[PDB]
Design an enzyme around this catalytic site. Structure first.
Site, PDB file in Angstrom:
ATOM      1  N   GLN B  32      12.528   8.518 -22.269  1.00  0.00           N
ATOM      2  CA  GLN B  32      12.274   7.082 -22.254  1.00  0.00           C
ATOM      3  C   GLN B  32      11.829   6.575 -23.620  1.00  0.00           C
ATOM      4  O   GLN B  32      12.119   5.427 -23.978  1.00  0.00           O
ATOM      5  CB  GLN B  32      11.232   6.747 -21.183  1.00  0.00           C
ATOM      6  N   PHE B  35      13.211  10.244 -29.336  1.00  0.00           N
ATOM      7  CA  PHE B  35      13.672  11.610 -29.135  1.00  0.00           C
ATOM      8  C   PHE B  35      12.884  12.577 -30.011  1.00  0.00           C
ATOM      9  O   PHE B  35      12.549  12.272 -31.159  1.00  0.00           O
ATOM     10  CB  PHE B  35      15.168  11.716 -29.444  1.00  0.00           C
ATOM     11  N   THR B  38       6.280  14.074 -28.702  1.00  0.00           N
ATOM     12  CA  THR B  38       5.126  13.449 -29.338  1.00  0.00           C
ATOM     13  C   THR B  38       4.732  14.172 -30.620  1.00  0.00           C
ATOM     14  O   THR B  38       4.449  13.526 -31.636  1.00  0.00           O
ATOM     15  CB  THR B  38       3.945  13.416 -28.368  1.00  0.00           C
ATOM     16  N   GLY B 179     -14.076   6.854 -30.453  1.00  0.00           N
ATOM     17  CA  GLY B 179     -13.756   8.171 -29.934  1.00  0.00           C
ATOM     18  C   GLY B 179     -14.455   9.249 -30.741  1.00  0.00           C
ATOM     19  O   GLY B 179     -14.832   9.060 -31.897  1.00  0.00           O
ATOM     20  N   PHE B 182     -10.600  15.206 -31.005  1.00  0.00           N
ATOM     21  CA  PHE B 182      -9.844  15.857 -32.071  1.00  0.00           C
ATOM     22  C   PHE B 182      -9.114  14.835 -32.931  1.00  0.00           C
ATOM     23  O   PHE B 182      -9.105  14.941 -34.164  1.00  0.00           O
ATOM     24  CB  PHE B 182      -8.835  16.841 -31.470  1.00  0.00           C
ATOM     25  N   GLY B 265      -9.058  10.074 -25.683  1.00  0.00           N
ATOM     26  CA  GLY B 265      -8.441  11.052 -24.811  1.00  0.00           C
ATOM     27  C   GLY B 265      -7.075  10.605 -24.317  1.00  0.00           C
ATOM     28  O   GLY B 265      -6.655   9.459 -24.476  1.00  0.00           O
ATOM     29  N   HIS B 444     -10.362  42.136 -51.925  1.00  0.00           N
ATOM     30  CA  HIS B 444     -11.474  41.616 -52.711  1.00  0.00           C
ATOM     31  C   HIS B 444     -10.948  40.877 -53.928  1.00  0.00           C
ATOM     32  O   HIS B 444     -10.061  41.395 -54.621  1.00  0.00           O
ATOM     33  CB  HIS B 444     -12.388  42.754 -53.155  1.00  0.00           C
TER      34      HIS B 444
END
Ligand SMILES: Cc1cc2nc3c(=O)[nH]c(=O)nc-3n(C[C@H](O)[C@H](O)[C@H](O)COP(=O)(O)OP(=O)(O)OC[C@H]3O[C@@H](n4cnc5c(N)ncnc54)[C@H](O)[C@@H]3O)c2cc1C
Ligand SMILES: Cc1cc2nc3c(=O)[nH]c(=O)nc-3n(C[C@H](O)[C@H](O)[C@H](O)COP(=O)(O)OP(=O)(O)OC[C@H]3O[C@@H](n4cnc5c(N)ncnc54)[C@H](O)[C@@H]3O)c2cc1C
Ligand SMILES: NC(=O)c1ccc[n+]([C@@H]2O[C@H](COP(=O)([O-])OP(=O)(O)OC[C@H]3O[C@@H](n4cnc5c(N)ncnc54)[C@H](OP(=O)(O)O)[C@@H]3O)[C@@H](O)[C@H]2O)c1
Ligand SMILES: NC(=O)c1ccc[n+]([C@@H]2O[C@H](COP(=O)([O-])OP(=O)(O)OC[C@H]3O[C@@H](n4cnc5c(N)ncnc54)[C@H](OP(=O)(O)O)[C@@H]3O)[C@@H](O)[C@H]2O)c1
Lengths: 459, 459
Positions: B32, B35, B38, B179, B182, B265, B444
């Protein structure tokens, strides 16, 4: 004359031996140079600090590629040197006092040579300051020293090595680096990123040749576009040119420069010990040790650059741990001793692009007649590589076709020494490429996806 | 009416299902929106590209720390957007053309709802364009959509979400992000590093509260010193103030800003499917699936954000792989199917400092009554941290004292998402902390030394 239960030559990795287990014995420590060894004072730690400072400048200079127009107003080289060694030099003082103030430990600050083995089996050690003392056990950690080409010594030109180049007063306009090794590549990245014109004069055809040929070939092409690479050339003579130097090459050419840096390899300090006169065998210029770091003389161990085939600190620390444990064991109780593990020794070169490798190269595996599959995955084929706009970073994986286990790993790109650690883990613990790629999660869209996709492409 | 052997709703991770094994069947793809899903268009890949550009700007801005005085002359935000989406947008067109031009695959570009199960056992699907068709198998990959607080919707103020904020024309002077998740942390790092004044308005007490408390406490203190953090606050109303917006908070105060970003969210798109009318169970707003990614309807699978408890792409890809394999098996032949593995799911937050975690937190292990050891190693106690002059980066490891196995790993600092990969490998394959620390070499003075020394310290 003095008597000691244990004597250690060198405060590099050998300094990490006197635990609290020796608090009841008397020990003698020898350090002709600055306390702490080479890696702390003029080795890994100072160099990698200058590398990071150079990478900040390189980020500023190529920031327009990402949409941020910036420019360097000034490179405060004096503050960079003072910041680096202002942290390092006090460590040498506090670490030295930690041994002097201990009543069980005596510190000799002059060159210590072996003497004739005493009749009662104890080893005699003599210093250039005139002192003489005996020890029951002896640990040899004399490290290595830089090697300068004989033609450069004969010329008598003012030159610098890795020991003295980092405390120079002012950054030169033009530098000539002689060598094609790890030190030569790392310092070329440091100076060119800080605004210095860098000229490489190498005798071979590739930089970092002791790496996989895919890495050396691609890295040399990149390095030749940002540094002036003169291949198949040796310095044969030179003279002073004011504060700078003028160097004649083996084809008649002359190079004018402000500073000369020699990075043509290092040699073990075993040949300055008279160890064979005391019963320690010496092949080439190194002390011969077995898998328990035991020499040909009873009670005498060795570790670090003076004996190991790898001139790496993480190897010298592992060898120092083996000596630390095997000193408390009986000399003939080899089955209760610990074995030095040299199966998967990694190494990194902190250049731009960064190089990190572990295991066998493609040509090394072919020479052993192994049936191998090889995949070369590009950084640019990964979501994190897109954000970098990377167009040269690669990851090379070699697996044994039969077992499917990793044979070698070679990374040339951003975060090379960090990306290789999961590959070091799989090789050291026998994890197959198929298991490593899909038997665990990889964070999206993190950078290690380039290692995951390198494992997936191993068809 | 049309007939298909398989139908897939969503071109995100579900697009990676039709291999050559389905070349002999007819398939219908529903999309919908744009293409590619997300993560490709408005998710992980575009965001992390802007993140890397932000790190370049912040490196220039804090370059005086290392001795290089530089400054940003201009931030060409217009060129940054065109560079990022100039790469992404053609992929959506070519990837879509790759599916339409295939004669066996038809692509529907409208929202697809479930219909009543047909008499022949096949599932009916109808689009908002009026088309109706049937399919024998159905794959649900509808993903998730942003959630906006009802008070913000009632105000009718012009606001932005993660789907639309990356295509802004000009960089704002002051941004208010609502918010504490993340997305909110990542964009706060992006905009503040490009010179934007960032104000966080969170209702909780910590940023990234669903992370280990050691990370939340230390990161929130650092973030609060460079961004304006307003804790225990909610937006209740607002109105337009020219091009900008003014937001009234739950304490009477009003905040004026140029741009509003909502990151409160996401919720699965299962509630827009009419799936319960067709036999697919829905609890909360998620699709119920078993360990084989099977729903309550025969022949119907699900994957991704529409069903998974983890809203992560690398998790959605693993579930898509399970659906891809289990589709070719008989619906009752559960013993020939593959099980979805959700053990040790990692995640990263691309903020400054960077955060990456996998496994259990300290408090979660205590709630399970496990005898645990915890070590918090600082970046600054490692040679690589010295070159960075790091004074806040930490890596936190939790192991069960009995078995000696890693229970959780939490890193907050430079290259957090890259350093966590060896820890993900040890946890996924059951490697103890002692084995990982000393059964392998660490380069190291590379960065993974901070993980090695963290493993040694779990006294
Ligand atoms: C520029 C540079 C960069 C490097 N970078 C890295 C890197 O990134 N990673 C890595 O793994 N390795 C690196 N190395 C190599 C590293 O320095 C060595 O592998 C390691 O330090 C070996 O430790 P050691 O104690 O055996 O040698 P040293 O640290 O040199 O120990 C020998 C010490 O004992 C003294 N000594 C020697 N003979 C005597 C004697 N007869 N009496 C008294 N004192 C004596 C020496 O003066 C010296 O102080 C680098 C080396 C250099 C030169
Ligand atoms: C800003 C942001 C940053 C992120 N960063 C990360 C990250 O760094 N790492 C990570 O692992 N994850 C990240 N994620 C999460 C990641 O994007 C998702 O977990 C992942 O894409 C799940 O894939 P999916 O196919 O299930 O969802 P999607 O890719 O969204 O697939 C759903 C698609 O189907 C369409 N669709 C939905 N319903 C219908 C219908 N009825 N008919 C037709 N089409 C329909 C949707 O429009 C959409 O195109 C991020 C997400 C966002 C929003
Ligand atoms: N980060 C790290 O791990 C790190 C960093 C620095 C150093 N190191 C280690 O330190 C040791 C010494 O480093 P290094 O760079 O000095 O040596 P190196 O890495 O062994 O390389 C030295 C190079 O010097 C060249 N060379 C020798 N004599 C020459 C001459 N007369 N004219 C021109 N070129 C000459 C050689 O090129 P040819 O081979 O073609 O002859 C050789 O490859 C090595 O063990 C190295 O791995 C490690
Ligand atoms: N790199 C990655 O792995 C990555 C990147 C981006 C996104 N993601 C994932 O994709 C999804 C994106 O979600 P997100 O970042 O938008 O949010 P989130 O991380 O899922 O959580 C947002 C937080 O906002 C707070 N909040 C919730 N409702 C609110 C309200 N009405 N008003 C004010 N504050 C409110 C809550 O904080 P409290 O919990 O403290 O109450 C909530 O946890 C998540 O699944 C996320 O984990 C992952």
């Amino acid at each position: 004359m003095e008597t000691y239960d244990i004597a250690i030559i060198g405060t590099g990795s050998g300094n990490s031996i006197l635990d609290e287990r020796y608090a009841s014995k008397r020990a003698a420590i020898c350090e002709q140079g600055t306390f702490g060894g080479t890696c702390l004072n003029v080795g890994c730690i100072p160099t990698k600090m200058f590398v990071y400072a150079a990478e900040v400048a390189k980020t500023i200079r190529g920031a327009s590629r990402y949409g941020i127009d910036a420019h360097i107003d000034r490179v405060r080289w004096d503050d960079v040197v003072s910041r680096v060694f202002g942290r390092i030099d006090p460590i040498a003082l506090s670490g030295e006092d930690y041994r002097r103030c201990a009543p069980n430990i005596d510190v000799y600050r002059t060159h210590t040579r072996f003497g004739p083995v005493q009749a009662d089996g104890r080893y005699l050690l003599r210093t250039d300051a005139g002192e003489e003392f005996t020890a029951e056990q002896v640990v040899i950690a004399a490290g290595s020293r830089p090697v300068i080409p004989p033609a450069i010594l004969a010329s008598g030109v003012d030159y610098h090595t890795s020991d003295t180049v980092m405390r120079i007063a002012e950054l030169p306009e033009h530098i000539v680096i002689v060598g094609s090794g790890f030190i030569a590549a790392e310092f070329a990245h440091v100076f060119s990123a800080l605004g210095v014109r860098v000229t490489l004069v190498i005798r071979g055809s590739c930089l970092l040749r002791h790496c996989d040929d895919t890495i050396c070939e691609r890295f040399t092409r990149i390095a030749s576009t940002k540094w002036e690479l003169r291949t198949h050339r040796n310095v044969v003579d030179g003279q002073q040119r004011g504060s700078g130097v003028a160097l004649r090459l083996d084809d008649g050419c002359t190079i004018n420069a402000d500073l000369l840096l020699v990075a043509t390899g290092r040699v073990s300090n075993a040949d300055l010990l008279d160890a064979e006169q005391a019963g320690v065998d010496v092949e080439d210029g190194r002390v011969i040790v077995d898998e328990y770091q035991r020499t040909s003389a009873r009670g005498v161990f060795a570790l670090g650059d003076v004996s190991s085939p790898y001139l790496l600190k993480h190897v010298a620390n592992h060898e120092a741990r083996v000596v630390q444990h095997n000193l408390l064991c009986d000399w003939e109780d080899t089955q209760s001793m610990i074995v030095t593990d040299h199966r998967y020794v990694p190494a990194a070169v902190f250049t731009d692009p960064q190089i990190a490798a572990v295991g066998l190269t493609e040509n090394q595996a072919v020479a052993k007649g192994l049936d191998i599959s090889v995949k070369i995955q590009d950084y640019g084929d990964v979501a994190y590589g897109w954000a970098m706009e990377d167009t040269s970073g690669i990851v090379k994986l070699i697996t044994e076709r039969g077992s499917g286990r990793l044979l070698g790993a070679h990374i040339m790109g951003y975060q090379a020494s960090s990306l290789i650690q999961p590959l070091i883990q799989a090789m050291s613990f026998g994890l197959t490429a198929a298991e490593m790629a899909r038997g665990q999660y990889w964070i999206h869209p993190a950078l290690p996806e380039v290692v995951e996709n390198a494992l997936l492409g191993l068809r």
